[PDB]
Write a protein that binds this ligand. Structure first.
Ligand SMILES: CCCCCCCCCCCCO[C@H]1O[C@H](CO)[C@@H](O[C@H]2O[C@H](CO)[C@@H](O)[C@H](O)[C@H]2O)[C@H](O)[C@H]1O
Lengths: 97, 97, 195, 49
């Protein structure tokens, strides 16, 4: 999912549009699909959750999926724009781009 | 002989001891294997063509070839040979070609 | 339980697009099932609970990919021209990403399918199931979506969004703007949470 | 990276009957094979003793 998002972001950014509006449109365009993705991921294991065999794994899966998705929605945008507005690290190489 | 066998206590049983057993055992997997290859070659043909009409058209020639295989066999009174039971498939392939 | 999972994913796609659009995708789902079945046949991998659970997981992932592809297709065609070619660009564009993500997931699954321990036996089945299912699923999504669309899909329309999700969109955009207001705060929260 | 290829869409749109027949044969094959699949409780892990 993270790869899908980064690909969608840098997809149209090749045009050099406003990074703010670029990421804004990226999110506004990937909002609906990611929802269904998380749904299909979390769900499916619900009917078998009653089965004691696939127990803790089912709960852990449905939990981690929702968590990772929510952050994929809010965390990475702020993180990427922060890393973009200014390069935090250093260690410049004089013989490399 | 079957009726005779039936006319006897159930605890007893009769079976053949000739060659039919071996012939059937040999041709056993044949029946359970050849149709798959038939569909395989059929799809293979469909690759070169693009319409089921032409498919059935050329397929009509395949079974009709059983005319000579028996016309040139009845007067000679030659028993149906196993080798022929095999070669007939090659005949199908070449005629379809 | 298998049929139950199938019907829940079915209603999911139903309420997702509303129209009988994703329903054709659901109809396309059994295809990969029969394919993996014949695969197991060739490999004699019989059925058992473990494999059934693996089937559930694989079906969810594959239907997810197929549905997102169909969704982007119908959206790009609806917002613009109504034509198969008015979607061929969407195919040519988002094709590679599907393959990438799918292969990455199969890679993440791989580990469980390599231990020589006594437990690796039960895991071997599910590993084979997931792998074959996912691969055949991607090939099916990229090789069947065209006809299914060209024959059971209406033309374009004008942009509009379900107002019920309007409030949800309000909250989402608002929280997005707020998260952008203080980026360092989000980093602090993430750090404390993970810790 | 979309260099010298991307014929997936067109070729898919073309050769319609081909994909149709492939789908049909695959479906029937899987269907017939399903009956002769085999059902068992769980894999028999090799006991070592
Ligand atoms: C001289 C060197 C070679 C010496 C002898 C070797 C002969 C050929 C190699 C033997 C390998 C056996 O492989 C062979 O197993 C089965 C034979 O019933 C075939 O058929 C198998 O696969 C099919 C499709 O999945 C299924 O419909 C069959 O039920 C299944 O039995 C395999 O398609 C074939 O690959």
């Amino acid at each position: 999912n993270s790869v899908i998002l980064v690909t969608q972001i840098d997809a149209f950014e090749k045009d050099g549009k406003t990074p703010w509006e670029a990421v804004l449109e990226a999110t506004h365009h990937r909002t609906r699909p990611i929802l269904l993705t998380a749904a299909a991921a979390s769900l499916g294991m619900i009917p078998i959750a009653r089965e004691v065999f696939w127990g803790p794994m089912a709960y852990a899966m449905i939990g981690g999926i929702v968590a990772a998705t929510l952050l994929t929605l809010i965390f990475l945008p702020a993180l990427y724009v922060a890393w973009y507005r200014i390069p935090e690290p250093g260690r410049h190489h004089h013989h490399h781009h | 002989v079957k009726r005779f066998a039936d006319g006897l206590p159930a605890n007893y049983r009769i079976e053949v001891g000739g060659t039919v057993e071996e012939s059937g055992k040999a041709e056993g997997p044949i029946a359970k294997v050849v149709p798959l290859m038939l569909f395989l070659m059929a799809t293979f043909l469909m690759i070169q063509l693009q319409s089921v009409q032409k498919l059935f058209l050329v397929a009509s020639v395949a079974p009709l070839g059983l005319i000579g295989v028996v016309a040139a066999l009845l007067p000679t009174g030659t028993p149906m040979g196993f080798v022929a039971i095999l070669g007939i498939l090659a005949l199908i392939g070449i005629i379809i070609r | 339980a298998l049929f139950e999972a199938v019907v829940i994913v079915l209603i999911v796609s139903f309420v997702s697009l509303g129209l009988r659009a994703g329903l054709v995708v659901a109809c396309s789902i059994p295809l990969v099932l029969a394919m993996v079945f014949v695969f197991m046949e060739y490999t004699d991998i019989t059925m058992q609970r473990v494999s059934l659970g693996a089937l559930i997981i694989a079906l969810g992932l594959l239907v997810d990919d197929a549905m997102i592809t169909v969704e982007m297709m119908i959206t790009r065609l609806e917002l613009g021209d109504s034509l198969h070619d008015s979607a061929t660009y969407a195919y040519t564009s988002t094709a590679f990403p599907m393959l990438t993500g799918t292969l990455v997931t199969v890679a993440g699954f791989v580990p469980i399918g390599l231990n020589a321990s006594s437990a690796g036996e039960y895991t071997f089945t599910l590993f084979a199931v997931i792998a074959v299912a996912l691969l055949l699923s991607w090939i099916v999504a990229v090789l069947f979506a065209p006809v299914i669309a060209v024959h059971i899909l209406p033309k374009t329309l004008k942009h509009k969004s379900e107002q019920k999700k309007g409030r949800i969109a309000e909250r989402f955009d608002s929280l997005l703007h707020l998260a952008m207001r203080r980026r360092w705060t989000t980093i602090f929260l993430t750090a404390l949470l993970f810790g | 990276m979309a260099k010298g290829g991307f014929n997936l869409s067109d070729w898919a749109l073309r050769h319609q009957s081909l994909v149709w027949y492939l789908m049909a044969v695959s479906l029937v094959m899987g269907v017939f094979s399903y009956l002769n699949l085999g059902r068992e409780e769980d894999p028999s892990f090799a006991i070592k003793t």
